Amino acid sequence: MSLLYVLLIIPIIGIFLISTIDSFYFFNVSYYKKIALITTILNLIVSLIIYILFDFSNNQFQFIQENLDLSFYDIYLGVDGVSIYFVLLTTIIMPIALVSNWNSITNNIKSYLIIMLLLETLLLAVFLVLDVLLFYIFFESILPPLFILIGLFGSSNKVRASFYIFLYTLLGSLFLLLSILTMSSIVGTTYFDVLLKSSFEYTTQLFLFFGIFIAFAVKTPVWGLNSWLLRAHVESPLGGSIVLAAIVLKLSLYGVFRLILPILPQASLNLTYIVYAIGAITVLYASFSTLRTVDVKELIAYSSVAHAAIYLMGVFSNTIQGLEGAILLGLAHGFVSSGLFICAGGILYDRTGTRLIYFFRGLTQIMPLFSLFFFILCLGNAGTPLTLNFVGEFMSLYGTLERLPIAGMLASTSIIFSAAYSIYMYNRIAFGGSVSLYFIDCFRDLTKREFFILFTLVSFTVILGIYPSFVLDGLHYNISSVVYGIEPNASYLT
Amino acid sequence: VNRILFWTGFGLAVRFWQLGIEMRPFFNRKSLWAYPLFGGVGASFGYWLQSIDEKQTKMLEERKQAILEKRARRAQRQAE
Amino acid sequence: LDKGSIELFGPYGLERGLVKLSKNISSLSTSHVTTYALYILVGFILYLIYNNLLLDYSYLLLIIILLLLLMMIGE
Amino acid sequence: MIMISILSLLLSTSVTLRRDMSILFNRISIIALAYCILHDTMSLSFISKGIGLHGGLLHITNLTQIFHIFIFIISILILQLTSFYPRKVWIPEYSSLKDIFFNKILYYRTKIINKMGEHMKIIEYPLILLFVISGAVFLISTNDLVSIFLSIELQSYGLYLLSTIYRNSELSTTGGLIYFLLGGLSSCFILLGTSLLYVNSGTTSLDGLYILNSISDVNSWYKPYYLNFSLLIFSIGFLFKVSAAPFHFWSPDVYDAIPTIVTTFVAIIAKISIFIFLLELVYYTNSNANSYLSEFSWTYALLISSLLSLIIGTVVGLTQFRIKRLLAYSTISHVGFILLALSVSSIESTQAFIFYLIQYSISNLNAFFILITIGFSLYGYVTNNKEYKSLLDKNNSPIQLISQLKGYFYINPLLSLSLAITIFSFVGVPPLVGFFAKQMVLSAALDNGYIFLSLIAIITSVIGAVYYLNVIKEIFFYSPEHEVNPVLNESDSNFSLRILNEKNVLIRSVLLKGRNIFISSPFSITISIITNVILLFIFMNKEWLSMGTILVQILFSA
Amino acid sequence: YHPKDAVHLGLKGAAVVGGIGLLFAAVRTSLARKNVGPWAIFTRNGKLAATFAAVGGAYDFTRAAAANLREKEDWVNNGIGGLFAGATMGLTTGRIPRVLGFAALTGVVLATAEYAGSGLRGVFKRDVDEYERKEFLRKNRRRPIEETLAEIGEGRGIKPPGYYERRAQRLKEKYGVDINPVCADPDQ
Amino acid sequence: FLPEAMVGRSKIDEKYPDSDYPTLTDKEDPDMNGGYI
Amino acid sequence: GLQHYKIAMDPALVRLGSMISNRYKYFRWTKRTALVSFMYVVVVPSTIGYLAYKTDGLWDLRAKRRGDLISER
Amino acid sequence: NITLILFLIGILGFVLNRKNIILMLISIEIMLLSITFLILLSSLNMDDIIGQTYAIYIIVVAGAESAIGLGILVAFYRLRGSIAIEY
């Protein structure tokens, strides 16, 4: 069997073991948690084995298994240098997601672990499948377990929040389905190798673009459309919020390198000015309203909207630099947003039971270790050099500017306004007076669990910010096949 | 995937779900014979689906050749 | 906007309108066989009118869309 | 074989008056339907668009036999509901082959198993279903107008009788009355349509009408306007029988009033026969040549019905609080997808039509079994909610409100996920089977120019998903209002079960509490086989979809 | 093209759409629960028939008018008549927001119905071999460079062979400046 | 012919009452916030 | 879930948050709200889009030297 | 022309009926007598015996619906005590 199926089967084996141990024993919930965490370690172990054996400049799909037994819907699993790092991020994030929420679930612990083990399978799949109809199948199988992850383990406004993400993500995904169905009917299949050969007529590509973009604007999400995220990324449990922002948000970032860039190039080129206008607006309106947010977890959720706009504008630049910067900023947001939900929804909400920023002040005086990590995370969210977030923004903004110079200049306002929301939140909670008077008793500082998941996540952000070539070497050759263009003395050689 | 493998497992999955819906214990020793019976029925149904597959393949093959005569022979008569 | 026109012109507007719409339509369903029979004949006449006068398809949608709005309005 | 079965069963039930003798007559109705499956299975060794039999008044087709067997198996699964007691008592001391085959268990089974329950006492219930099945498998194979009329009445009249068979319920008799009075008017429409066919063509044979339509379809004294006008009246009656809007107000009321056992059968079987019959009629009334004939195509009524059924079925269901009324409206939104695939007559739409009908008949069946099993499960539970106290026919429909399902995840977690997997299939979420059905219907419509209807369909699918999620939120997002019965576990309350042997000597005595009472195996196994088919279709799709591709290859062949 | 009398056609919609709504008021009176009488169809439910008449007359007239004004026949006019129809729909409820909301909801449907093609009747048949049409669009993998340039245009990173010499011409014609870049090397 | 509890429009108004959706006017709510003084 | 530490929850601030979370239920269409809802959603993005349309491929700085022109069109 | 008029009478029995579930029983049979009567008069015109036979089988199904219809109406009356529709 292929080694890419081993990534899928392990979480499946782990769900089986959680449901069949109580039959060998009133077993403790501690042993439920250990099995799920070990089984996400193994996926990470395997995924690094896949990465050692990867070939950084091969234009054929790798780790493929020859099926030669065709059906109507067959799983085809290939790994490519444009998808490898999305897989690695998934497998590094899911253990922290489990450890972060280790004592906070308290009830329905089996069901909680079985959903996350299910989620890791489906999100691993969406990066590994070699069809665009297969891509859609897994891109939307994550929807039922997320409706239940929010309504069982979510906060007060959990019911409306779970309806919002499900219904918005269902609606937006059904316009992508109509366009995928058109592509398949014209071409006969949705297997990548046969689609990338095929070139659609301009008018068809103009109508496939309207349909793949409706979906991804719903799933970025852009400003006019993000009302599900400000509910779902907040009412959800801590572990739900980590997966939703780090991994689920990137399903459409990686889905533009497959669905738009190679098969609808003329449409992408001629409509970019519409994308850039939308992207510029969500860099401003989201930045303006991230200043006035009184919910700490909601402030982090709103930050993701402004970040996602920068990478969306990068993936539409037709430049090798904005394309790699978009993947780097997708990865960068993955580690940093994870840490700030760990700070907001998993530490202050553990100790105070509230998310209102009015009750917090001067937390440096009694939690110095929280303050140190909270400040480093806050500076990466502000796009400060030495973090992977700065590199992703620099390259994303450069390509946005080289393609359409006016929108990149309005996108670069982020540099100013991301810094203004990030420092203002940090100053209000850690600094900004003395330990607040609403704290009747003292609050303990970080536990050894809270320290080491923040430390792990922060370490990824810095070392990748110093040596981004750890991720750039795989991207260069594979990214070099989604650029559309020619130069006069370099093309059509004889 | 292998049909005999999928269907054998499908029968083992059907036993696990039935005990879960009944809330009866999975794996009590004096009832473990159910898993072999459910798996054997899953093996047998699948040997029947392999015979179904074999015949359908012949039929779809013939038809794709017939549509390739109708399109051909019509083009032959349009050459006049 | 965020807590306003975006939600009034969207999920909260659609929620408020549709629930009122469906309460009105289900106010038609009265379990009176006498009223059900008239509804079937009414639905029969419209089919005959549609597919015998060769009416413009657009003429139908105007009726259908105009009907939905009257169910949005109460009293 | 269905006819030999009705006559033999009729003679046996005619000379008995014993009500304890009903469970066994339902078991023989399952064995009887198994011989019919062995006969139609062996009648599938030929290729033909059709063979007229019995003087041309009947026809046999590969699509006709497949549907005959599908009808017989869907019938064998509903029959299990009346052939096995709802609950069973199981102990690991009596669980091996030697025990279940050579040993025996003796205890007071009457109040545990509901031996004298209502659904276990009607003796003619296995017979009435067998007369409905007969009308269904005749309608599939009708080659003449009179045969159509006589078959549709055989099926319709037996549905009315099934809906009135709980004679001591004010609800059931009310529903049978609504069904007969609105069903009789539908039959006038079907009779008017056929009469106007023969009176203008001189023929009652469908093939002659197909040829008169074939010769007319060419791009003066006798325009064939009657065919499209006759078939539009004709389809109005069949639209009512399948409850497509606008003629749908009857189904929510009848499906909620009659007992849930009964609504499994009545809400499935009539659509399977009516929709298969219409497909052959749509194929041979097609206008290949764009002429004035295609402007009055009768298929437009199905296009307007499908459009209206998509809207009505998904909008009106938002405010339902009764589960059976909810499921009635959900079926109307599913016939809006079946009706669009039928209206676009293409090779892709017919293959998508065939898949949608079979898988939806299979999944809505799971939705009916899960509901009936949850009703039987609450026997060991009690509740103090004041609203449940005032419900009517609490024995014929145990679950009536969606609020009675609050916190079922806490009572039975996998039964709740079976109801989740089935409802998410109605929504059309991947990787579930019901996704792959709506995918095919949308692709068929888009490929052939029905872009406007596709956008309407995906919009209403969002709206219809709202009331499906309300059911899911109710079962999982809250804590139950149902508590375990305190007496069943009282420590002093135990029922003695005796293990005997072949020569009736005690092997063991055992003390059992309410913790030793479970769901019966026929119900648990049936639920798990269908929940698994919905969840694992992406790994087992070749034989099911290939059967449809071959079937439409013949109907369109030559 | 052939001009059409807008006023005539506009009345036809009023009678066609209004005629149906008159049948709806007939249903309302027949299902009245009191002894309201036959003439109640024109007194109690008259506003039901009037709004159908108003909407029908606005649509067909305004569309036929817009057809004459633009001297074209296409999906666009089914839009203009649609907006003026929903505009009349909201005039009855007396709320300004509903006037815009109904018009948006009404007009977007009618344009979408027409541009997508007439679905509710017989869809137009091209009467051509579908196997040839589908197979051509699957194996039409390369195109003449000139064909793509028309839709996207040379520039924006699409610099086809000879772009610089052409750009020289384009700039000279517009700015009026001869292009002569500096050697940037002191020898040769 | 069916009981009012089952088809009646009333229990929809009890399960989905119109009061779920505020409709305060310019007098009782100028800030559009809920009557927040 | 877990019991948190004691917080002097302020009756005033709790209802302020409860005001914000429920704020959208009271939004109305007035002449004031339409004006803001029209400028932010339509005018400002339409204005940005127009500049994005008119300057597309207008300028390139790549390799351009003295004697050459930044304008590409 | 008599056949169509008598069909209208059955239709109009459904138009004017708010309370009589018995007249709904009656008008269905007036509608059946129209359609059978139309089939018969066209059979005389075409010298066909199949139209006569088709009438016979309509008459036999028509009587059977009366038995099922009056039987179900009896089952309803036993628990109701009234055939009336409150309105």
Ligand SMILES: CCCCCCCCCCCCO[C@@H]1O[C@H](CO)[C@@H](O[C@H]2O[C@H](CO)[C@@H](O)[C@H](O)[C@H]2O)[C@H](O)[C@H]1O
């Ligand atoms: C497509 C469908 C939707 C996709 C998402 C699927 C989500 C599946 C969730 C996991 C399956 C159900 O998870 C199930 O939860 C119930 C809750 O009563 C647990 O059941 C147990 O809960 C607690 C645990 O301490 C016990 O005290 C209690 O006695 C027992 O009922 C099961 O041990 C667990 O397996």
Ligand SMILES: CCCCCCCCCCCCO[C@@H]1O[C@H](CO)[C@@H](O[C@H]2O[C@H](CO)[C@@H](O)[C@H](O)[C@H]2O)[C@H](O)[C@H]1O
């Ligand atoms: C482009 C437009 C957007 C596309 C589609 C977006 C649709 C999202 C709208 C969903 C509306 C919310 O859906 C509905 O919300 C209410 C709460 O408000 C929920 O109601 C629930 O929460 C309330 C909170 O007091 C509780 O009484 C209870 O837990 C429950 O009734 C319903 O269970 C849900 O049906």
Ligand SMILES: CCCCCCCCCCCCO[C@@H]1O[C@H](CO)[C@@H](O[C@H]2O[C@H](CO)[C@@H](O)[C@H](O)[C@H]2O)[C@H](O)[C@H]1O
């Ligand atoms: C950035 C733009 C995002 C767009 C997101 C998608 C928009 C979806 C389109 C339809 C949205 C619903 O649009 C909304 O309709 C409902 C009725 O259903 C109206 O809701 C309300 O209308 C009027 C006020 O105008 C009220 O008196 C009435 O009681 C109520 O129904 C809203 O005024 C309208 O804005």
Ligand SMILES: CCCCCCCCCCCCO[C@@H]1O[C@H](CO)[C@@H](O[C@H]2O[C@H](CO)[C@@H](O)[C@H](O)[C@H]2O)[C@H](O)[C@H]1O
């Ligand atoms: C969960 C779903 C699992 C799959 C369920 C469906 C599996 C069964 C599908 C069988 C039907 C298609 O498979 C095939 O069809 C054709 C046409 O009907 C038939 O084929 C038959 O006719 C030919 C023609 O004379 C005979 O020579 C042949 O021996 C005979 O088998 C059979 O029926 C079956 O061989």
Ligand SMILES: CCCCCCCCCCCCO[C@@H]1O[C@H](CO)[C@@H](O[C@H]2O[C@H](CO)[C@@H](O)[C@H](O)[C@H]2O)[C@H](O)[C@H]1O
């Ligand atoms: C385009 C498709 C997408 C848009 C579709 C929108 C459809 C929305 C349907 C909403 C269905 C009902 O959704 C919800 O139902 C619950 C039922 O208690 C109610 O929810 C209510 O709960 C409490 C009482 O318990 C109320 O005080 C509160 O005002 C409200 O949250 C409301 O009635 C509605 O918020």
Ligand SMILES: CCCCCCCCCCCCO[C@@H]1O[C@H](CO)[C@@H](O[C@H]2O[C@H](CO)[C@@H](O)[C@H](O)[C@H]2O)[C@H](O)[C@H]1O
């Ligand atoms: C960081 C992103 C940077 C790229 C985006 C901004 C690029 C701006 C480039 C501006 C210069 C482009 O090229 C420039 O065109 C402008 C057009 O008015 C000319 O500007 C000149 O135009 C007229 C003649 O028409 C002169 O009389 C006038 O004094 C001056 O405005 C310059 O002579 C030419 O050099």
